[PDB]
Design a protein around this ligand. Structure first.
Ligand SMILES: Nc1ncnc2c1ncn2[C@@H]1O[C@H](COP(=O)(O)OP(=O)(O)O)[C@@H](O)[C@H]1O
Ligand SMILES: Nc1ncnc2c1ncn2[C@@H]1O[C@H](COP(=O)(O)OP(=O)(O)O)[C@@H](O)[C@H]1O
Ligand code: BEF
Ligand code: BEF
Ligand SMILES: [Mg+2]
Ligand SMILES: [Mg+2]
Lengths: 417, 417
């Protein structure tokens, strides 16, 4: 008796099971209400019920166990968590809790937690003694997260160009700067697919705030990982809540020496949401940005770091420029002094239908020698010195024509000499 | 005895009928008052009266049935809908209701609804069980909505250029960016005529907010569809109300697997209206735009989506640029990074009296391979690569001179090779 197991079951089988259990007509009923009635009827027989979810401690002291399939939205099937148990096990926002639950009695509206069985997918004896995320020693990117497929596919050209322009390692904090209508969607899809193919052990999390739902359901059915999104039909409060829950879960996972990867596509939208939810202080800067509005996105971005004791946190955010709004322009670069990695995309190259439209000149990675060998770094330096004199479109055409001849970049580097 | 039937009748016949029924002199009376008196006299004999309209639920709990011929304006002949029936049939704003009505008794001012016969042009048993619009899975444009006439007319050149620049499919969410005095009116008229000619099965709705009455009555007598407009003589409150009613009706139609097409021509004017009706919060951004003013137009624009279960919603809005106001430059923009189709028009080409004055270079459609075949996409790519080096005016002249030689674009593509 698990909550996620009943959530994954279809509607027809749940209706059939409820009709066999002998309850009210479930055809004219919601799936969540059907599951609730089935759990009630199964607990009336004396059997136990189990559930799971991410903890969201409220300001009063209690909390609930949000579900991932609903993008951490407030649902009727949330499991209550009393503050007594929180105080007894030192629980915090983001801790994954899995234990026995019971249906609400007369006068209650949510399931109660009796005994916790597993904390953060581990024993509670290992979670009671742990080092906080704020005390971990940061470090630079040491492990190399190669994005090249290696299967010789035609779509691998984007990953090869990305590796030649800006290699990505564990704990990297980069930025994907690109004007609208440049190809950010396809680039993010390719990055997510390459991460899921090359490094399936890492925890991939794609955050899409204030996006077109069709794109949400497309990304959810395309990438092999977790997708937490919030369409534009929701207020900025839900955006802030989802961002907080995601970053808290990422911190709790990193605290257990896990490799978390967050592919953010709405850093600008997140900053707009934070500027909308912040109370007015009577002081407005140039472009309509509050003085204390960028602090929360600043911390959300700076949360990414590489841990020496174990694990890492990678955050790749895509910033929006040339959107016609001065607020986004002020945000983007305020954040430019940030992202230890900038991958610029050119609109002029995208208009020529030359995919990918990557600005190789302004791209780059700091401390790239820690992720590449000596000969590889020398070859990349020679390639950059050869590409720099040529124009952007000409350099992109040259790179595409030279990478189409071979499958691996090593052969291209060997033929360049 | 139908309301719309009496509304379509002329004034002279209604006056004659009222004089034959033996009532007060109807020559010095309004047509609506004449219809009201005729309905009263016909109901005094014991016969039944029927009406219809779009439901507009008020904040208190009751509602009225607005009429389409009055642009959903508050009229004396609105049918009152009690909240009891709303609670009994789960009615919402936008549901088309058609049932028996009765004249108001002593102390009443509006017609009452006794029994509902048809809901959303369908049986109530099919409307009681339905999936909300917020739960439908979005998708990209799959079905091709070809705009080419095919009759070899001289006006078909605009549709041919539009198809070669940006093909339109079901569920598309585009933008027509053009400075003033460019030819937006003729272009919108041609688009509406091509939609009514090629795809007469789709529900066409043209929304004109804050425009001149002459243009309104011109569009109403030119296109073959529904025209809901609101001239500048009305406050922004009526603009917001009309936009809400139109989008709610569109959502209710899409919920019944219908293909709705909305040709918006005032996205900038709608954003200005929303910025005017929003209460001041003491925080003004660059250009005079409120922080929470663009949220409602953002949702109105993002409502457009393609449904996998059935139906679609297409919204083609025309944004205004270079109007001398910085608010529109932020308002029209901020919207640039939202849609997935931009059809730019050049003022320099319009000054040369070269119609249509379309910027073929900056135009385009994302995921265009889902609406065109392989050979068609290759021919469009070759045409774009040939047109790109030439200047805007030169490319437009070349395209016009090459399309004037033949009737179909297939012959032009075959002759280009
Ligand atoms: N690698 C690519 N190959 C082919 N087309 C692409 C590629 N990247 C982008 N595009 C085209 O650009 C359009 C928009 O790209 P997108 O990633 O949505 O840009 P952004 O996210 O910056 O708005 C897509 O619909 C696609 O047709
Ligand atoms: N396809 C066309 N053919 C001929 N003239 C046009 C065409 N499109 C626009 N025009 C001219 O431009 C004028 C204004 O066009 P309009 O569509 O009103 O531009 P906008 O809507 O951008 O203000 C029209 O009065 C018309 O004379
Ligand atoms: F319009 Be893109 F997604 F920035
Ligand atoms: F003056 Be146009 F209608 F933008
Ligand atoms: Mg995008
Ligand atoms: Mg116009």
């Amino acid at each position: 008796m698990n909550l996620t197991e009943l959530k994954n079951t279809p509607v027809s089988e749940l209706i059939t099971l409820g009709e066999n259990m002998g309850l009210e007509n479930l055809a004219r009923m919601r799936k969540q209400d059907i599951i609730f009635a089935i759990l009630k009827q199964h607990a009336k027989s004396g059997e136990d019920i189990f559930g799971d979810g991410v903890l969201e401690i409220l300001q009063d002291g209690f909390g609930f166990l949000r579900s991932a399939d609903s993008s951490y939205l407030a649902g009727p099937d949330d499991i209550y968590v009393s503050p007594s148990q929180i105080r007894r096990f030192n629980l915090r926002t983001g801790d994954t809790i899995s234990g026995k639950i019971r249906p609400p009695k007369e006068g209650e509206r949510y399931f109660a937690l009796l005994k916790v069985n597993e904390v953060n997918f581990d024993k509670p004896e290992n979670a009671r003694n742990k080092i906080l995320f704020e005390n971990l020693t940061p470090l630079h990117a040491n492990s190399r997260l190669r994005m090249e497929r290696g299967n010789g596919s035609t779509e691998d050209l984007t990953a090869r160009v990305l590796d030649l322009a800006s290699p990505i390692g564990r704990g990297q904090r980069g930025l994907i700067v690109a004007p609208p209508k440049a190809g950010k969607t396809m680039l993010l899809q390719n990055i997510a697919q390459s991460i899921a193919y090359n490094h399936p052990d890492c925890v991939l999390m794609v955050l899409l705030i204030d996006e077109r739902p069709e794109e949400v359901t497309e990304m959810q059915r395309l990438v092999k990982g977790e997708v937490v999104a919030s369409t534009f039909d929701e207020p900025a409060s839900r955006h802030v809540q989802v961002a907080e829950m995601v970053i808290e879960k990422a911190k709790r996972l990193v605290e257990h020496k896990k490799d978390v990867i967050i592919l953010l596509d709405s850093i600008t939208r997140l900053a707009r949401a934070y500027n909308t939810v912040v109370p007015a202080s009577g002081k407005v800067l140039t472009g309509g940005v509050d003085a204390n509005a960028l602090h929360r996105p600043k911390r959300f971005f700076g949360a990414a770091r590489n841990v020496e004791e174990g694990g890492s946190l990678t955050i790749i955010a895509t910033a929006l420029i040339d959107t016609g709004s001065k607020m986004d322009e002020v945000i983007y670069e305020e954040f430019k002094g940030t992202g230890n990695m900038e991958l610029h995309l050119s609109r002029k190259i995208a208009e020529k239908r030359v995919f990918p439209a990557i600005d190789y000149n302004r791209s780059g990675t700091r401390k790239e020698e820690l992720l590449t060998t000596q000969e590889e770094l020398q070859k990349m330096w020679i390639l950059r010195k050869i590409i720099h004199p040529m124009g952007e479109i000409d350099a992109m055409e040259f790179l595409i024509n030279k990478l189409a001849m071979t499958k691996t970049n090593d052969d291209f580097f060997e033929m360049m000499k």
